[PDB]
Design a protein around this ligand. Structure first.
Ligand SMILES: NCc1ccccc1
Ligand SMILES: NCc1ccccc1
Ligand SMILES: [Cu+2]
Ligand SMILES: [Cu+2]
Lengths: 655, 654
């Protein structure tokens, strides 16, 4: 009954969310339910393509839902057909726990503030029982605790203290960790260390201007401004969610979990519109902490699956986050009651100056002969907040046909208390008195659904190698011979591969059915990514079992519908045992992945060893990966862009 | 002359003139030409004494290199400018020096008029009267064991243009003339066993008039993106001294390294703290990967063979630096000893750099929020090495990091490919009859550190899992991990490569000092992952002429004049002998812990060409960064005005 959208990948409108919740409420009449997730169920890949390109059936508009029911363990999930307002698919899942929404997180603080056992711990730690309004917490999922499994829905409250509401609480962690039952709203346990450490008596480590004035005397004067103006408008064109820019076309989607989803990406190669990717997104994360001491093993957040890069996203406009002529998109979710909620300006789109695209000058007339073309890049960005952390996400299209993911980490370190006589090392750093910032890794799983110049793709590893022939042979007289060794993956097992400095390893995604007429190589997009940490948690560890994708830089599996989330559909409190998510998709490693519909999951990120520079608030730390056309074109695709400056040899002779 | 303000300033045009008059008169009655006339930088100890200890103002000195007609090799030495005298000299009969703009310019005329060359063109299918259509790129010979350093030699890489406006690289010829640079005479031509004649295809061109023919039309002019600074800039220049966002340093420039950054300090709330004494690019090598003759001679060491100063583009004419720019000029000597000037060789500006930091509280729906935006300072040059473009950006940032960004553009070096000829596995057929050979581009970053003062060390930092196994009392859940730090004791310890298996980084630190919070020494941390292994084999010509290239990191003791890791005079050295990095390494046993050190970092890329790269290549990026870690006690940027800030208390009031 709701109006269907312009485009089948368009996110659910507020009206569609509302229709969905009404329908689901009616199906479960008399049962006390709440809504965890109401989100688009995207159309099967075959149907979307058949619709888009073959005059095919229009795909059903579907809402996927996850609910809880009071007094029932676990969740229910299902699908609503929006045209007919009915529930077409249903199941109860009594042994999983679902993503934690903003409403789940905001509850927990008032729960621990009112708990007599927590209050008593605060008293023993040096906070008087009448000042519980000053105790705050970051309510994480418990993550995984073998004492409860998925038997109850749990959060672990990492507790802190503020002397004033404007303080940054992270200089003042407390020593204990309350375990809260999310649905009953009660503290069921508190992890208490053997060595007590009372609340720090130092000043809070603050960072607003009033705080800096006191700490350092004065603020630096306001800098003279840099202004950016586009008086004739922008060169990109939006039609609903569909973007066109510098020959690129694609759909900008968004959802509670992944945040930005770019679909149906193609490039217009002088009138021939060539597919590149069907879908590209961040599909999961894991942030594993490296202190072995109890209970710090429970810090290994899989932020996308346990909280959501959509649900956590910041409204962008007030902050001055995106500078210049900006196009915004809003996100729409359900709340607990089933009412649409909106986050305004969730996504910001703009184009920027990107330096030189290409330059060449001739030494013969002293660089008089010269051609110089400037580069513009298209940025589609979101920023999300995961308690203490900020993740800035920028998807970047470039004028050479390349596509790049840029990330900047900022926000504040997770911190735990440190005794006056306590050494942080080797597992963490003393970033401020009485403050221990544990070592950790931030790891991301990029999901790529490729369609390189069409259907039937493959992937390889490409390793730079010296010729096998020795120096002074006929084949390699001066020892200088080298090549690129290309290892095509045949089955899933062959693809499980790590980045390797010793070969400067890249990965190709390519179309074996086609051939570049100049070079004779298949057309390809090449993954060029060097920020690929190995997983430092040991095999069989809780971190490695809960993120089976993260132990390889690259995982390539057959395409199947609904293979989005590589640690499973319902991540919180999964032990990491069982065949689900990546472990399921890998299977016995034998399925074909040569010239077929494939998915390519790429683990990248950083290993962070904190230092005082990071504190009390951390300077942006950049991460990046690129996908470059290699043998996709027969020549530089930017040559038809007007140069900033051009003089030929004959024009230069004339002057 | 008059002395300049600052002892690190490059030589003025007057001073170069003064330099070459003095050398003219000391070699009175001799035909000599000038190859280099340039600042000899004062000893690091002299300089620091003048700067900080009331010490006398160092003497203004000029380093020169000259050739004398009829004499092998070169002569080099030093001129004391204040007394117009030669104070040091010596003759190097068995080296060859850096190739100047003019030594390059005369080769084409030499080969166009040479009769064996003319004959090779005819057999290649170009008539003897179309020789104005034959071009070459005049490289050093690099090294050829048929002549050593016994003659000064170039190798002319030959191309063909149908029209002077063509880009010549779609049309290489098959043969390679060898030219005596000083006799202006071709002495040999390398001719392959299988001849391949000039391509019949159209040239692969890239000017808008060519593109109009090739694809119908140019894209419409895009809507402008304009950058103004109505109130001017935040940085302040005094002569060549830069002040910005608490950094202070001197911007120098010479013929070989191009940009040289000296005396780098950071003003930490009134405490002026040293970071580097000097940083610059000190050498390159660009080893091609085709084993076939004569292509083993493609391995240009661009900095020592041609000079990133000598090769640099005037900027501004092209729209190379967008915004409100401050420019510096370069000054050199030509062959006759007269000052030449390259206008606008260096550009200085500030640009937006995204967010510096941000944090919002989820508790009031992100209404509690602070956002501060980043500005970066860019000091750059662009140089042309025949077909290649190298864009160099030294970047300072407001978290106190220094980054080097490089962008590679220009044109693929190409060689001819036959109709039936397969280019793989040593190159790519990027256009019909065009073979673009595999190659690496390697750079030697030279750091003379002075981290929070004198007495420094360097280490490798390697992320590692705990050695204790999953299930033990020490690592119950198997997640513990730490950074293993390996302090380099002796030169040999430092010889290290980037390691993905540990995400290796390198520290340059002051072990005499201590961070009050963390208890670690103050450090700048080299974060760099574009660290290709040298693919050329041990004992190869490449590995011998670039001994620094075989390790990502090489740390050696400071001595004055330890600048150029492939030796002072690079063209035609075979790579045998104890000089440059090989001399500085020695037997490997010298101390590098807590002393004056030099840190030489090898980084860059391995290039397997693709058609996207032809006929003109899109910028390929290379970066490395040096980040303060345990240097400060907190984020140094917090005193910068936020672009937006709202407290929890303010958010309630609204
Ligand atoms: N990375 C853990 C997290 C996210 C959001 C809220 C609490 C904790
Ligand atoms: N890179 C080789 C080279 C440099 C400058 C001029 C000619 C050739
Ligand atoms: Cu971190
Ligand atoms: Cu290259």
């Amino acid at each position: 009954a709701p109006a269907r959208p312009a485009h089948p990948l368009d996110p659910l409108s507020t009206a569609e969310i509302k229709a969905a919740t009404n329908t689901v409420k009616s199906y479960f009449a008399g049962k006390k339910i709440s809504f965890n997730t109401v989100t688009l169920r995207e159309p099967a890949r075959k149907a979307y393509i058949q619709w888009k390109e073959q005059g095919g059936p229009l795909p059903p508009r579907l809402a996927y839902y996850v609910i809880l029911e009071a007094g029932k363990p676990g969740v229910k999930e299902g699908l609503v057909d929006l045209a007919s307002l009915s529930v077409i698919e249903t199941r109860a899942l009594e042994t999983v726990q679902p993503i934690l929404t903003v409403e789940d997180l905001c509850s927990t603080e008032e729960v621990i503030r009112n708990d007599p056992a927590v209050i008593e711990q605060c008293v023993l730690s040096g906070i008087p029982a009448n000042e519980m309004h000053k105790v705050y917490c970051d309510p994480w999922t418990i993550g995984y605790d073998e004492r409860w499994g998925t038997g109850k829905r749990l959060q672990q409250a990492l507790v802190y203290y503020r002397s004033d509401e404007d303080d940054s609480q992270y200089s003042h962690p407390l020593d204990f960790c309350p375990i809260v039952d999310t649905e009953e709203k009660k503290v069921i346990f508190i992890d208490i260390p053997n060595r007590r450490r009372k609340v720090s008596k130092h000043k809070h480590a603050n960072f607003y201007p009033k705080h800096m004035i006191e700490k350092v005397g004065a603020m630096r004067p306001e800098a003279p401004p840099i202004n950016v103006t586009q008086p004739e408008g922008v060169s990109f064109k939006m039609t609903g969610n569909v973007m066109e820019w510098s020959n690129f076309k694609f759909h900008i989607g968004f959802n509670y979990r992944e945040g930005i989803v770019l679909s149906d990406v193609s490039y217009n190669d002088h009138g021939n519109v060539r597919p590149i990717f069907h879908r590209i997104s961040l599909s999961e994360m894991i942030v594993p902490y490296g202190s072995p001491e109890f209970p710090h093993q429970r810090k290994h957040a899989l932020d996308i699956g346990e909280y959501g890069a959509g649900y956590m996203t910041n409204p962008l406009s007030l902050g001055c986050d995106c500078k210049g002529v900006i196009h915004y998109l809003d996100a729409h979710f359900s709340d607990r009651a089933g009412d649409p909620i909106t986050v305004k300006n969730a996504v910001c789109i703009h184009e920027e100056d990107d330096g030189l695209l290409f330059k060449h000058s001739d030494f013969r007339d002293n660089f008089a002969t010269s051609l110089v073309t400037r580069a513009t890049k298209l940025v589609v960005s979101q920023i999300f907040t995961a308690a203490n952390y900020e993740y800035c996400l920028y998807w970047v299209f470039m004028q050479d046909g390349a596509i790049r993911l840029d990330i900047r980490l900022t926000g504040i370190l997770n911190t735990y208390i440190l005794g006056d006589d306590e050494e942080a090392g080797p597992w963490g750093t003393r970033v401020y008195p009485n403050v221990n910032a544990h070592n950790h890794q931030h790891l991301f799983s990029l999901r790529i659904d490729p369609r390189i110049d069409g259907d039937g793709n493959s992937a390889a590893a490409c390793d730079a190698k010296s010729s096998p022939y020795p120096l002074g042979s006929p084949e390699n007289m001066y020892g200088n011979a080298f090549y690129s060794e290309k290892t095509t993956f045949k089955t899933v097992k062959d693809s499980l591969t790590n980045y390797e400095s010793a070969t400067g390893r890249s990965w190709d995604i390519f179309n074996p059915n086609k051939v570049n007429p100049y070079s004779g190589k298949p057309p390809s997009y090449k993954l060029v990514s060097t920020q690929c940490p190995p997983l430092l948690a040991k095999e069989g560890s809780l971190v490695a079992k809960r993120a089976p994708w993260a132990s390889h830089s690259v995982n390539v599996v057959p395409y199947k519908d609904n293979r989005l989330y590589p640690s499973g559909d319902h991540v919180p409190q999964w032990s990491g045992d069982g065949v689900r998510g990546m472990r399921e998709w890998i299977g016995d490693g034998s399925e074909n992945i040569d010239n077929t519909d494939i998915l390519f999951f790429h683990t990248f990120g950083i290993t962070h060893f904190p230092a005082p520079e990071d504190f009390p608030l951390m300077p942006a730390e950049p991460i990046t990966l690129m996908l470059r056309p290699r043998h996709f074109f027969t020549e530089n695709p930017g040559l038809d862009i007007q140069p900033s400056y051009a003089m030929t040899t004959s024009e230069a002779k004339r002057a």
